[PDB]
Amino acid sequence: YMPWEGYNFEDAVLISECLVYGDIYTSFHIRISQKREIKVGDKVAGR
Amino acid sequence: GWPPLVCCFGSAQHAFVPSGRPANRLLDYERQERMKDAVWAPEKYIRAPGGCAGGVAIALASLGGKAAFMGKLGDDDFGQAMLYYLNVCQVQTRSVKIDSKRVTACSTMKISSTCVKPCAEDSLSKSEINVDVLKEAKMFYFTTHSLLDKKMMSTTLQAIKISKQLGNVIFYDLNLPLPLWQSLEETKSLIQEVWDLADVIEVTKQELEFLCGIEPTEEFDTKNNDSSKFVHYEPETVEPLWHENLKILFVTNGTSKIHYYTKEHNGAVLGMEDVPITPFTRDMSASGDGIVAGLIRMLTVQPDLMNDKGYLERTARYAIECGVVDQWLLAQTRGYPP
Amino acid sequence: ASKQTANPWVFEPEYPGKSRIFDGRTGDPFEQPVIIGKPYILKLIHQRVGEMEVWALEGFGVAHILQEMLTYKSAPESFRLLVRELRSLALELNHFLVSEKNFQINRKEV
Amino acid sequence: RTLQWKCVESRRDSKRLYYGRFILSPLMKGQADTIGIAMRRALLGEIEGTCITRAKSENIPHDYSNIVGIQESVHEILMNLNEIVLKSNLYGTRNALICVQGPGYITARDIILPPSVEIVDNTQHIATLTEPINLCIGLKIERNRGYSLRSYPIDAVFMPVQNANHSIHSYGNGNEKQEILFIEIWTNGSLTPKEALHEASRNLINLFIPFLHVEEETFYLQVTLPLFPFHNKLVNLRQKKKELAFQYIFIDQLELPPRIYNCLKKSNIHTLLDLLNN
Amino acid sequence: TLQWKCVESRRDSKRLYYGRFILSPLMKGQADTIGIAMRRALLGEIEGTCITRAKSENNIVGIQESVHEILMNLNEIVLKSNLYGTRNALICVQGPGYITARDIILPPSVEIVDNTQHIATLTEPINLCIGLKIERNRGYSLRSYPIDAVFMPVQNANHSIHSYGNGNEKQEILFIEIWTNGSLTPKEALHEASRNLINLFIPFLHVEEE
Amino acid sequence: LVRKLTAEELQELVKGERKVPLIVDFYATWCGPCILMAQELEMLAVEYESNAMIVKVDTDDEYEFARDMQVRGLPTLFFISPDPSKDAIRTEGLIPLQMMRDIIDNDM
Amino acid sequence: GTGFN
Amino acid sequence: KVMTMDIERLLLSEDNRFEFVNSVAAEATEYVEKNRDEYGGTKKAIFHVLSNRVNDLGFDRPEAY
């Protein structure tokens, strides 16, 4: 938890590319399925 | 005006390599060299001393020194190409007496072995030395290649004695040409006349061994860094050659190790030679040109420390770095064959 | 966790739970300790022109944008509907405009 | 040497996790951090790695469906292939096979690699076969850096340096304030820590050497030798009898006296085209 | 292939030279690493030269400036040299009149960048020699007043990165900006920084004898 | 195309009768630019094959001939004339291929 | 606003 | 970047912001009537009007800056 150069302004969040590497937040959405990775503009929350 | 100009005397023909000798390189054969077969290495490591004096001028200009190349190119297309190449490399060619009566690279007659009508670069005359350049040229660089033709010998000795009268430092780099390794007594009979006049000398470790007559009592291609390969010959091995003027002799085993000697100090700096080797750069010549240019740069830009072991260490290190950087650039530009 | 792993930065007694951390683009430490953790993070699941926008646009006087947003972006046909439904209530919503030059009472197309 | 480095420690916690700590000592103040950060970024980002990038199950029931007689889904085996570690030095595109023809465990040791690739850990489990199926799958391998985005693509990442750290300590010279740098590297066994340190250094040098290449991209009007395009210029001009451009003529080749040449050279007048300045 | 060009150059003062340099094309992520390392090298790995001490063996009478103001105007003297170790320069002026950087007697390898730089004004006929210790040092390194000049041949450096060509390789272009202090040109500073970086990283490729 | 000789075979080739100008290229296995030269004069060979003829001599072990034919370094190449009414140009350094064309077609 | 007149 | 300072300059020049913007709209629609070159790519009639007007103020801005 530290204020980076505005990219975490008022609860924006920075993530590492490793969260894309590791499939850490990869979901499957079924319609056929799509391997939705984590992206800019995705929402995350702690409990 | 500052920086002090260095005058580099001799030939400049492109990619001309005067000789090649068995050599040893400081390399981790265990691990990298046995592990990467993607990197290229020669089946026999033969290192060249260096290149043309124009090449050293171009190198020193690239190091930000000021260099004036002294010679003549011909008025033929290759001579104008060389003159452009020198000028775009920021080398001064106010000393190049471009001459329409000569062809540049072509020595024109041999029947067999004949000496008739030599090329432009072989035929600079004593009246074409730009003495007003040698007034400003605080260091004069020349090589044994200037001494093969007796006309070039006479012109060289005149330029040397002019520079001595003007107080210039004489830097003699053998780059011992191919016709000379076959006779030590011939070699000394040729070079002694300038050797006694040289204020600074560069010799490869192989050229030192040759002039000392000591056969290489060491392994070459054996895949180890046994320090007996990189022997630092004791001062009493080189005192034979120490004419009473020489201030600092550098003995270079390429970029692997540069030894230096003076009347009072001697030592060596261990460099590195695991730079990219390629065909088109197999001979390691440009590392030698970069080493010589780095020595010239440091010694010319601080002449008063010609005999300070701290400065000589720094100068040898700087030369090792420049050589590494140059053979690197060369590898990256020349490339790899298909 | 500190003393077992020999990671003394995990429990810095000077400011427990915080540690100094470094800028990956610089290598210098940020000069104040940053709170660090391994929290549990969950990924979450995933045009009316409004009256208060009309009020705002007309507050700016920017009324040609207001006209665009309320007419040709979708008399205007909705005013035709308005007049037609009142006309269906048996009230004549009659639109006139007066010629400044001629005083002629031009009836609008409604 | 005065400036010296050594492999102060190395460990091999697994065939897939090596560790190495290195020291470099008598650095001067501000050298150690300039080294450390550049080396860190080289290790973490500019090291290349080899891994499987594509898979083709030779019989596919459907693009997304389960596979018969395997104790785990196609997705689990694709993830197990993603976790394969490869040791190649040569770039380019390469291919490989698994052809396992009975029940048992398919493992990295069962991958038939091309000559230029080596398995880093033979023991890595890939798939469990309960039935005696002639399971054949093709693989396609690539060497690259970072990440990249019918046969399945594998979302593999080419990053063999698993982590890196450095620490900077006063050497204790009260005047010169020399410093000691420690570097630490965790790698997949695709590289030893020392080999990753060497390749990081060499890649950094390959990034900085460009600024020492022939300056300002301006040497002629790609080519190995640098004086043949101008020779061809001179040849074509002579054939065309087209004289020579003033841009390629330099004041240094004119007869003008030293006292003027010095002043012009100090003025950075070089070509006769610079005498466009009236 | 990787090539660099000088995109812009300026000389907005005799003690402020500006340059901007493009390097292209670069692989994903290389441009920032290059820019960071180069910026650190420029801003403190370049060896620079400046006055490091002054002796005025005679507030001194008849000088208009306070001695502290003399020293602080001496700090603004910009020098370029290839000195090894320290060396002695010497002001010597007999008043009245201006003492300026032109009046520095220089040790052999030193040259003044802006000879018009002020130093002191002598309001009356007096002797003022000043004995100056000069040094060449890296920026990060380190009757006899220290001038504490900060060996800063580069006043500022910056970089930026841009994608180009819209090509799906996403290779990118680096722009480095340098404000050299006039003791170096921007292109010389770029070369010196690159070479000093290579001299820092070569040590990891040093083999040692057995 | 380009043919490695030995000093005795080159001697008999040069003292015998010839139809065409002979180029003899002195090279070594250690030499970098010599490979560039071998490419240049392989282009030369393929463009001249019936009109000029090219051989190469290895100064790592023909070094007595070398030091006998005034070779001051490497690469160096000799354009021996097809007839002895006038004799051999020698050229040193990595010369442009056009500078070989304007020998073989403008000196001969 | 803009449409004053 | 800079063009809005020119806008502010012209806003400062004209005695009614709304009348200024009306005059700009008029100038643009008469431009796009007196000339029927398409003039709709990387440069726009509004910026052209602002450019010509700031050039009348004497300031060295090119058409659509």
Next chain:
Amino acid sequence: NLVFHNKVIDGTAIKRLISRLIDHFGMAYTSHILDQVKTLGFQQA
């Protein structure tokens, strides 16, 4: 133009500063000054 502060920026103090900037320069300068002070704040944060 502006006075050197040598004192801490309270929110009221920066409200004063920005208002005085808008009143002195108008929008033209202040819309850039404040947009750069954004970047300054991000940098120092």
Next chain:
Amino acid sequence: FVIRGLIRQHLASNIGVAKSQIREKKPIVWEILQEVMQGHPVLLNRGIQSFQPILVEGRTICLHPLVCQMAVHVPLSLEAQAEARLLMFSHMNLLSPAIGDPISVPTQDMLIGLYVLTSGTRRGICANRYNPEPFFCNSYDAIGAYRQKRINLDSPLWLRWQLDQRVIASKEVPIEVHYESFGNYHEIYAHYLIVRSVKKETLYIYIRTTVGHISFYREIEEAIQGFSQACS
């Protein structure tokens, strides 16, 4: 407008061909879309304010933090585009009209960043354990010494305030003055020093300050200069 652009470049012969190319989404379509977006404003609607769009990577609309499911609208007519650009920009509306209160004032991280930026020195008891600083001849020397880690952001330093007008004060009389027998004297204050003499004149003010305060002042002065650069 993309169709109109493809007609303008003559890359489509009819609007159906233009729509077909747009469906094909080839790079030409994005080049013409960049040409169309250049200089065309758009309205954003939460609360309704207009901006210049720039074509950006990704898929989610990106907004400036101080201007911050936003809706987006294109003004179609030339009169509307003129009114949008000249009336409806944030540049035109920095004040909230209710009293004339600046809207865009630095807030959230930036304000506390500026607070720390301007916290500066530790004072007195917080700075020395017992009861009992470099001089920089200009601010770029101080910033250089900071970058070279000779001094820290919090640390006190003296800057020669040669712009010796505009000295800030707290209506406080000199905390001390020193007079030399030769009639130079130094006035020392809690924030600055002035050297001046009964002969000659004031030499210089030296302001006691921090790299943080220096940076706060300098970056505003340089923002004014960077804006007024176009006045040339």
Next chain:
Amino acid sequence: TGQVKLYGKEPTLTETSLYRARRHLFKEERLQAERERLAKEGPMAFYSEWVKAWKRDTSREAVQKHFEETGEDENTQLIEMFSHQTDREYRIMMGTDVRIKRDPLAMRMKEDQIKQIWGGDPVYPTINYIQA
């Protein structure tokens, strides 16, 4: 450690509030005493605190007397000493990193003292919370 004296055996809330106001002064004083101990002892004797496996004499005199035979200068001896440092010892030493500047006292407080930061073991035993 005698750096301070207190009115009683336990620091009052006034004293701890003043420490809260002034701790960075005492921290930088301890770091300065640590730099000065480095300068006096030399790197062998200083850093041997974190190389328990290095049994040899580390004093400057012994480093010199070892250089006078083994040819290894002080730097090669220091590289060897660190070559005997274990990874855990190195991680502990990294508190002395010039960027970390960990408090010399916080590096050397023992467990039974650090425990007093939170006030000893929790009364409800954490084994009730621990899950594999």
